[PDB]
Amino acid sequence: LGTENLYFQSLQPRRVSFRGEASETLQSPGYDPSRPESFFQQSFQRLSRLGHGSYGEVFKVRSKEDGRLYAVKRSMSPFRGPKDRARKLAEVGSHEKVGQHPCCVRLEQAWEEGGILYLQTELCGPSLQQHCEAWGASLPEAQVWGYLRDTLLALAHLHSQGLVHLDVKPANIFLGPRGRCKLGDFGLLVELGTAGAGEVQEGDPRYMAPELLQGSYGTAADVFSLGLTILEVACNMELPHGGEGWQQLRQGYLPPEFTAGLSSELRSVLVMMLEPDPKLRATAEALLALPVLRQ
Numbered sequence: 001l002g003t004e005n006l007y008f009q010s011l012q013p014r015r016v017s018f019r020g021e022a023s024e025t026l027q028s029p030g031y032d033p034s035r036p037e038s039f040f041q042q043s044f045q046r047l048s049r050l051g052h053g054s055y056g057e058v059f060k061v062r063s064k065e066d067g068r069l070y071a072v073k074r075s076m077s078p079f080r081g082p083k084d085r086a087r088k089l090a091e092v093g094s095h096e097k098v099g100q101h102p103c104c105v106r107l108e109q110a111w112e113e114g115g116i117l118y119l120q121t122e123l124c125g126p127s128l129q130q131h132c133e134a135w136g137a138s139l140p141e142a143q144v145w146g147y148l149r150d151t152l153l154a155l156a157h158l159h160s161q162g163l164v165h166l167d168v169k170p171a172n173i174f175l176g177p178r179g180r181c182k183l184g185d186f187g188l189l190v191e192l193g194t195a196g197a198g199e200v201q202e203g204d205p206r207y208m209a210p211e212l213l214q215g216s217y218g219t220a221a222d223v224f225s226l227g228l229t230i231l232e233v234a235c236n237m238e239l240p241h242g243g244e245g246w247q248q249l250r251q252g253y254l255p256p257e258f259t260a261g262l263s264s265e266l267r268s269v270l271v272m273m274l275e276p277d278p279k280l281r282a283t284a285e286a287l288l289a290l291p292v293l294r295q
């Protein structure tokens with residue numbers, strides 16, 4: 001990748017896909033390629049900004065094609081070059097590899113224009129982080145068990161295919177109707193056994209599995225991250241980025257000032273998920289087999 005001819009070469013949208021229909025031309029009611037506005041500008045009603053960061057922005061939109069609501073994630077600035085472009089496009093690939101699942105945020109379509117990547121997904125509710133902020137307290141365990149089960153279902157789906165999300169956290173879990181949720185943000189997702197060697201994009205340090213400090217990547221890392229995710233939302237407990245507390249949470253410590261009110265059942269499951277040794281840590285499939293996590 002770091003050596004292509006025409007390294008610097010950079011107008012109308014091109015579909016990004018699983019090599020099915022695409023590579024392809026896009027069309028839409030409201031879109032005329034000879035007008036200078038982008039496909040995104042012409043083909044959607046932009047309703048609000050749902051999120052933003054160094055990556056770009058996510059908008060709530062209404063599609064002019066079907067009049068339905070979606071989210072569109074748009075990258076910040078034109079591709080830096082071939083490696084940046086490949087890195088960003090790989091998020092679409094990760095969706096293709098994951099495939100559709102009721103506990104994963106669904107990708108509807110993706111395209112690039114003018115060096116910008118656009119991912120149009122289903123519109124979900126707020127993140128679990130945002131939900132906890134609105135609640136202003138610990139979530140009732142009845143809510144927690146549902147979110148735990150749904151995100152475990154998502155992880156089992158990824159893990160069965162040798163995929164690791166690597167950034168499981170409340171901010172990347174989105175609420176659905178009637179108590180469900182979905183795992184999203186596949187930007188850091190990796191397929192084990194494929195380079196880059198030291199497949200090095202790092203998730204949020206608050207939720208990182210301890211074995212990742214020595215580069216031991218595996219599906220078990222996601223189970224640990226989800227354990228801390230659920231601990232945080234069930235206890236309204238801020239997680240340390242580092243220091244003594246960060247180490248203790250990775251040595252089996254459950255702070256009594258925060259966790260004394262957990263049911264024995266939920267505590268028991270969290271201990272399984274937070275096991276420091278990834279070889280001993282429960283798998284998502286194994287957790288989902290526990291009667292307490294049944295349908």
Ligand SMILES: CNC(=O)c1nn(C)c2c1C(C)(C)Cc1cnc(Nc3ccc(N4CCN(C)CC4)cc3)nc1-2
Pocket residue numbers: 049050051055058071073105121122123124125126127130174184185186
């Ligand atoms: C890197 N970022 C993302 O992947 C990402 N961020 N958001 C906010 C979304 C994504 C996805 C996973 C790519 C797609 C998506 C799909 N749906 C939502 N829904 C949503 C709804 C409401 C809100 N809020 C409403 C109240 N507000 C003050 C803003 C937060 C945030 C997100 N968010 C998103």
